[PDB]
Amino acid sequence: NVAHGLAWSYYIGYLRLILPELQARIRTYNQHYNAVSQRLYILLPLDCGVPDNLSMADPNIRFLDKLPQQTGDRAGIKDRVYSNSIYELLENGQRAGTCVLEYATPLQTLFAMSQYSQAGFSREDRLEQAKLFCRTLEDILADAPESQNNCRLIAYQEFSLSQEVLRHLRQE
Amino acid sequence: NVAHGLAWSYYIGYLRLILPELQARIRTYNQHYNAVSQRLYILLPLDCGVPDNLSMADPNIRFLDKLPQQTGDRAGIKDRVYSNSIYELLENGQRAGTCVLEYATPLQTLFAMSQYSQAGFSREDRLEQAKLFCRTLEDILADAPESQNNCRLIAYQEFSLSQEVLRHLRQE
Ligand SMILES: Nc1nc2c(ncn2[C@@H]2O[C@@H]3COP(=O)(O)O[C@H]4[C@@H](F)[C@H](n5cnc6c(N)ncnc65)O[C@@H]4COP(=O)(O)O[C@@H]2[C@@H]3O)c(=O)[nH]1
């Protein structure tokens, strides 16, 4: 039942930190360039497949630009860098959306853990850990004060990813 | 018993990634500047106190320089940035060492988890989670192929931190 601690690491070490600074960072892209949506869209695939090149998972998802970096001194590292990537979502060759898009990196840790033998985590426990992680996250982000209209969880299991993201975007 | 998954996240998401590239990154600092020791020194305080300004924990530890950044495309983020900070360690006003020094950020997640109520982690379970994390890490790094003379764990409980680091440095 390792996912529960990974959900909290994900909040306490990242989301808690970048969400506050997020809308201010997005305004600055919109005003030093042309536009972009005001939430962090976090992809939770339940098969825990997390490719590194978002566009390699779907062509209709194309990288456009990096947001302005965030920096902070964290646990000895001077100027540690949180970066986020802006993606354009196409549909029938028309671009129908723009947002900050990314996977939930903890899901990568979960996949890896299920191959390494001394991690004591079976291959089959993956899908239920993925669900317990999405669930524990969702609890957190509901009560999260840092979280007020600034990120949207996108969990799914398998298909069009571009269509699946366009779904949530078209809801506000 | 959340520390075990945090140890693996720490290996699979960071150490596995930066250790390989580490000595090559250190050579480049030594040859585009004057020198620095060839291991990553990772601080594990067992009280899980992890300040952000390493020098605020001890004056005899002064920041000198950042290493050249590492970048990679990771889980949708283009050019995600791993940074590391080089510290000079003083003793009776003489600098007696230089290395890449940093805390184990998971220890920060552990501390935080023990204040948040819906994390189900008592204040008193901190010190044994800190020990289980140091232990599970040490297992990993022993068997870690990426790990061959490139990082040294420095666990401790309380005192001079500068003296404690100088201890391990003076062992090779
Ligand atoms: N997309 C995205 N995700 C992130 C980012 N930063 C954290 N998360 C995720 O948030 C959680 C809290 O992270 P935290 O730093 O507390 O723990 C980490 C940390 F100790 C260590 N580590 C990783 N990078 C490091 C670095 N540059 N310097 C020093 N240590 C580092 O490896 C652990 C596992 O990292 P990871 O698998 O990447 O997932 C992270 C955790 O689950 C981000 O910039 N982008």
| Domain limits, chain B | 1-36, 37-172
CA–CA separation, B46 and B24 (whole Å): 31
> What is the SS3 string spanning B9-69?
HHHHHHHHHHCCCHHHHHHHHHHCCCCCCCCEEEEEECCCCCCCCHHHHCCCEEEEEECCC
Note whether A80 contacts B: Cβ–Cβ < 8 A. yes
Nearest CA to ligand 1 atom 24: B14
CA of A14 to the centre of ligand 1 (A): 7
Q: What angle do CA A28, A34, A38 make, to 5 degrees?
A: 55
Query: Residue A10 is encoded by which pair of tokens?
Result: 């994900």
Specify the DSSP element, H or E, that contains A107: helix A106-113
Residue type, A167: R
Residue type, B138: E
A82 lines ligand 1 (CB under 6 A): yes
Identify the closest residue of chain B to A112 by CA–CA distance. B12
CA–CA separation, A10 and A137 (whole Å): 8
CA–CA separation, A58 and A65 (whole Å): 17
Note whether B130 contacts A: Cβ–Cβ < 8 A. no
The SS3 assignment for A149 reads coil
Nearest CA to ligand 1 atom 3: A105
Largest alpha-carbon pair distance within chain A?
Answer: 50
CATH number of B37-172: 3.40.50.12100
Strand B61-66 versus strand B77-82 pairing type: unpaired
The SS3 assignment for B106 reads helix
CA–CA separation, A10 and B169 (whole Å): 33
Nearest to A161 by CA among A74, A76, A41: A41
Nearest CA to ligand 1 atom 30: B105
Q: What angle do CA A152, A156, A159 make, to 5 degrees?
A: 120
Residue to mutate among A1, A2, A6, A9, with most B CBs inside 10 A, is A9
Residue to mutate among A1, A2, A8, with most B CBs inside 10 A, is A8
Query: Residue A9 is encoded by which pair of tokens?
Result: 């690491």
DSSP B94-117: EEEEEEEEEE-THHHHHHHHTTSG
Identify the closest residue of chain B to A80 by CA–CA distance. B83
Distance linking the first and last C-alpha atoms of chain A: 34
Q: What is the resolution of this structure in A?
A: 2.8
Considering CB atoms only, which of B66, B80, B119 is closest to A8? B119
The contacts of residue B53 (CB under 8 Å, 6+ apart) are A73
Identify the closest residue of chain A to B103 by CA–CA distance. A75
* Way it was determined: X-ray
How many C-beta atoms lie closer than 10 Å to residue A106's C-beta? 28
